[PDB]
Design a binder for this molecule. Structure first.
Ligand code: CLA
Ligand code: CLA
Ligand code: CLA
Ligand code: CLA
Ligand code: CLA
Ligand code: CLA
Ligand code: CLA
Ligand code: CLA
Ligand code: CLA
Ligand SMILES: CC1=C(C#C/C(C)=C/C=C/C(C)=C/C=C/C=C(C)/C=C/C=C(C)/C=C/[C@@]23O[C@]2(C)C[C@@H](O)CC3(C)C)C(C)(C)C[C@H](O)C1
Lengths: 171, 180, 171, 69
């Protein structure tokens, strides 16, 4: 499984860890420990992006709140202060690995074991990674689309669906 | 003695073995590492819990009956008389609870956590765990009531009914986004 | 092992406190430091609470001396929410780095209480025991400033100006 | 007198009446007048109109639950 026809798998990535399709052209994960951190960061960027994309489409589609780039409604420093106070111990404990000062105890800091239904395997890890990459792509799309089309992403989908050959990337 | 833990893959403290009801390996702040304190903590946990269970029914039920809200009771009721008369009534009862009996030296050695006031012989090491868990739930609840009292300034049944009627316009997010 | 004495005339030190760590005066009636791993953490927290209190009791007084109002009038002179947001946004990396003992994912194993910032080489046992001593004052002081403002309602320095001209009739 | 109000069914009725504004957004009017609103009347005669529930509705409903059980 490769990202283009036969680009020779770069030797830092062999194919043990899920989501390997032999990419890494810049060789950013040439060292094993930086690869380890990159893996954490990939899955975490993924999971946030998936919440984010559901967030932005859901608020405009399902809850009729309006476009996601409208921020004039609420006071941003207040939400920021609240959000940072709430997120601080949770993002410390995640990075830490637990609650102790020397804390590297207990669970894994990428897969901490919050599965009631017991559905964690290599395949589901791959599925998580693949949906994460798609969501990251989508979230980048939303930002760039917001700055080029100047209107809501569902409005963008409306314009492509109405007339795809006239309304596309060469707007 | 298999027992569950409060957080997935953690390891329990070594002084929490499961020897006592409703142990879930939860003492990160190490407040029960010494055994004699763990004895008192155990009595305190059951007693704070029992009082929170009484409190939370006491707070909810007169508001359900339309007799008033629990944190507004002190404009119809004088606090200082209530608290004087209550401490007069409670004092010999609390005394005897801590004492272990009526005698000056304890004498009639009773359990000060689990006396025998049980006519149905229902006491097991399971019902003990149920009493603890219901109590912990009520303590968390009474914390909720107090914070909700300050933030929303309405009663708890009113707070529930508001969430049910307008779940998006009456929740912690919306109530803390505004000055409150 | 207590050369420098104890908190109460004839008191026995607790069993976990054996005069080994700085500024131990054998004071733990609630036995919060019985577990050693917890006491290791407790030590760092006390020193940090101490170092934060000393910058705070200065910051509550030294502005007032230069005629800027008291500490409870600082809300008039700044935008309270906004500075609170930038404080939380700047504390987030630096507190994480303090806790992690470095910048890398897999911890650092630097002393996270006493990191090594000392170009004057004053790091001695006396100074460690004076950090905590001056610290315990400043915490007690800050506990005063709050309770003085709740019982009175004038400025901190005004309460001192009262007590010299009103020894009997201060309380 | 001593009221027994069917508060769950009232809650459900209200939610069904407000549905066209959030939870069934692309719908114009609610599914029926029963949930609330105005009287539909063809010529003089009433086609449909809101059906309100109170103590009497509570007792009959619990009689129904009894006889089915
Ligand atoms: C408020 C306190 C706070 C703290 C202490 C942390 C701490 C951390 N973040 Mg989290 N993060 C935070 C807020 C915080 N974050 C917020 C508000 C967001 C937006 C929701 C994120 C989104 C985020 C992402 C996407 C990532 C981190 C990552 C990290 C870790 C590495 C950071 C680094 O090396 O520089 C570290 C544990 C990174 C990480 O874990 O890499 C392994 C990482 O990729 N954070
Ligand atoms: C990840 C999935 C994804 C999906 C499903 C879409 C879907 C769409 N994009 Mg978006 N886009 C994406 C990622 C995505 N994009 C990314 C990663 C970028 C940055 C390169 C963009 C930058 C972008 C621009 C500048 C435009 C689109 C437009 C569109 C719409 C027309 C098709 C097209 O031109 O491309 C369509 C709804 C067009 C549009 O908005 O239609 C009205 C358009 O002008 N996209
Ligand atoms: C993401 C954080 C996290 C996760 C995954 C868990 C997971 C769990 N908790 Mg823990 N817990 C947490 C944070 C968390 N908790 C926090 C912040 C507190 C407050 C200190 C607790 C306090 C707590 C108590 C008091 C108990 C648990 C219990 C449990 C188990 C309950 C099972 C359930 O289905 O819950 C339903 C939702 C489960 C292992 C229970 C347990 O031990 O079950 C075996 C239990 O009694 N937790
Ligand atoms: C006054 C309330 C109170 C008291 C005295 C205790 C006491 C105890 N708990 Mg219990 N517990 C409580 C409330 C309480 N708990 C609540 C509300 C929950 C639900 C979150 C639990 C959930 C729980 C679990 C899952 C476990 C315990 C356990 C214990 C025992 C060991 C831990 C300890 O000593 O901490 C002593 C606690 C205190 C000194 C309370 C002070 C707390 C500070 C002031 C901050 C609280 C404020 C915060 C914002 C809320 C001890 C007997 C463990 C045990 O072994 O039980 C058999 C155990 O596994 N507790
Ligand atoms: C557990 C602690 C507890 C405490 C401190 C209280 C305290 C109170 N109750 Mg509550 N009550 C409780 C449990 C408690 N109750 C429980 C468990 C129930 C359900 C059985 C009730 C049911 C109840 C009702 C129905 C009412 C009260 C009322 C009151 C208030 C007036 C009592 C009085 O005038 O003289 C007390 C004199 C001595 C104790 C001596 C007082 C604040 C009255 C009130 O004003 O409601 C808002 C009221 O109508 N209580
Ligand atoms: C009026 C006299 C009175 C007396 C003599 C007592 C005596 C006692 N109370 Mg009680 N209590 C009282 C009124 C009283 N209480 C009232 C009015 C309330 C509110 C309803 C309580 C609620 C209460 C709680 C929640 C707890 C106590 C506990 C205790 C014991 C420990 C005291 C302590 O702090 O140790 C010094 C250190 C002690 C036996 C504690 C206990 O049982 O600990 C094991 C405990 O947790 N009491
Ligand atoms: C508030 C932060 C703070 C922290 C984390 C500590 C932590 C510590 N102190 Mg210190 N102490 C403090 C403030 C603090 N203290 C202040 C302000 C004074 C001056 C009165 C002292 C005076 C003092 C003496 C004389 C001694 C200690 C000692 C200790 C160590 C063992 C006792 C323990 O486990 O406490 C843990 C503390 C807490 C969990 C704080 C919570 C306090 C409760 C829950 C609330 C109290 C507020 C209430 C209004 C009173 C531990 C490192 C002993 C030691 O070994 O020194 C190295 C010792 O002999 N302390
Ligand atoms: C805990 C430490 C701490 C904190 C949170 C603060 C917080 C603050 N200081 Mg203070 N200050 C501190 C320590 C602290 N100070 C110390 C150690 C000194 C002596 C160097 C001062 C000397 C000082 C002056 C001269 C002034 C402030 C001012 C302020 C306020 C605005 C800062 C700004 O605009 O940028 C803010 C409330 C400003 C202010 O608005 O004062 C009321 C201001 O003019 N501070
Ligand atoms: C840390 C050392 C310390 C020092 C030197 C002072 C000094 C003072 N205090 Mg403060 N105070 C402190 C800590 C301190 N305080 C602490 C830890 C508390 C909590 C117990 C208080 C709570 C307090 C109150 C309620 C009052 C004082 C008052 C005073 C003043 C008069 C003396 C008195 O009545 O007490 C004097 C300037 C009095 C005052 O403000 O004079 C006008 C006063 O009413 N103090
Ligand atoms: C792998 C590799 C390479 C690469 C790469 C690539 C393509 C990287 C791409 C990265 C990418 C594309 C990362 C996106 C993340 C998006 C996130 C986390 C956003 C969350 C956003 C959230 C949490 C949104 C929140 C909100 O929206 C909500 C819900 C409502 C709004 O009202 C308010 C806000 C906005 C707050 C190289 C460099 C090419 C060579 C190397 O060799 C190997």
């Amino acid at each position: 499984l490769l990202w283009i026809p036969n680009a020779t798998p770069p030797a830092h990535l062999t194919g043990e860890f899920p989501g390997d399709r032999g990419f890494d052209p810049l060789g950013l994960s040439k060292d094993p420990k930086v690869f380890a951190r990159m893996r954490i960061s990939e899955v975490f960027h993924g999971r946030l992006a998936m919440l984010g994309i559901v967030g932005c489409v859901g608020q405009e589609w399902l809850f009729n709140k309006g476009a996601w780039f409208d921020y004039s409604d609420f006071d941003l420093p207040r939400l920021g202060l609240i959000a940072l106070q709430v997120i601080a111990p949770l993002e410390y404990w995640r990075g830490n690995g637990g609650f102790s000062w020397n804390g590297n105890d207990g669970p894994d800091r990428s897969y901490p074991g919050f599965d009631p239904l017991g559905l964690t395997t290599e395949d589901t890890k791959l599925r998580e990674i693949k949906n994460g990459r798609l969501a990251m792509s989508a979230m980048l799309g939303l930002e760039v689309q917001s700055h080029i089309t100047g209107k809501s992403p569902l409005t963008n989908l409306g314009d492509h669906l109405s007339s795809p050959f006239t309304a596309n990337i060469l707007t | 003695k298999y027992r569950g833990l409060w957080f997935p893959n953690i390891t329990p403290p070594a002084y929490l073995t499961g020897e006592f009801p409703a142990d879930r390996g939860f003492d990160p702040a190490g407040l029960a590492a010494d055994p004699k304190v763990y004895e008192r903590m155990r009595i305190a946990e059951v007693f704070n819990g029992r009082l929170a269970m009484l409190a939370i029914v006491g707070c909810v039920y007169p508001e359900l009956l339309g007799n008033g809200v629990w944190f507004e009771v002190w404009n119809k009721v004088d606090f200082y008389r209530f608290a004087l008369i209550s401490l007069q009534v409670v004092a010999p009862l609390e005394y005897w609870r801590g004492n272990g009996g009526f005698g000056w030296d304890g004498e009639e050695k009773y359990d000060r956590s689990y006396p025998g006031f049980d006519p149905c012989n229902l006491t097991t090491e399971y019902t003990k765990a149920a009493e603890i868990k219901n109590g912990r739930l009520a303590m968390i609840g009474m914390f909720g009531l107090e914070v909700q009292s300050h933030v929303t300034a309405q009663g708890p049944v009113a707070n529930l009914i508001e969430h049910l009627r307008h779940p998006l316009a009456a929740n912690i997010g919306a109530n803390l986004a505004h000055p409150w | 092992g207590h050369k420098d004495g104890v908190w109460f005339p004839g008191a026995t030190p607790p069993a976990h406190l054996t005069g080994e760590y700085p500024a131990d005066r054998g004071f733990d009636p609630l036995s919060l430091a019985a577990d050693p791993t917890v006491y290791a953490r407790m030590r760092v927290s006390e020193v940090f609470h101490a170092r934060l209190s000393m910058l705070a009791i200065v910051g509550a007084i030294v502005p007032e001396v230069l005629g800027k109002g008291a500490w409870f009038e600082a809300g008039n002179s700044v935008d309270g929410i906004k500075l609170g947001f930038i404080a939380m946004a700047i504390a987030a990396p630096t507190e994480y780095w303090r806790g992690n003992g470095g910048f890398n994912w897999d911890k650092g194993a630097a002393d996270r209480s006493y990191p090594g910032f000392d170009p004057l080489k004053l790091t001695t046992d006396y100074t460690k025991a004076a950090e905590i001593k001056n610290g315990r004052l400043a915490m007690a002081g800050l506990l005063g400033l709050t309770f003085q403002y709740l019982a009175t309602g004038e400025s901190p320095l005004a309460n001192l100006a009262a007590h010299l001209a009103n020894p009997v009739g201060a309380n | 007198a001593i009221q027994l109000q069917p508060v769950f069914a009232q809650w459900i009725q209200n939610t069904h009446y407000l549905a066209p504004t959030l939870t069934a957004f692309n719908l114009v009017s609610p599914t029926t007048p029963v949930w609330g609103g105005d009287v539909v009347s063809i010529s003089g005669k009433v086609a449909m109109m809101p059906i309100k529930l109170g103590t009497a509705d509570f007792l009959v409903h619990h009689i129904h639950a009894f006889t089915i059980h």
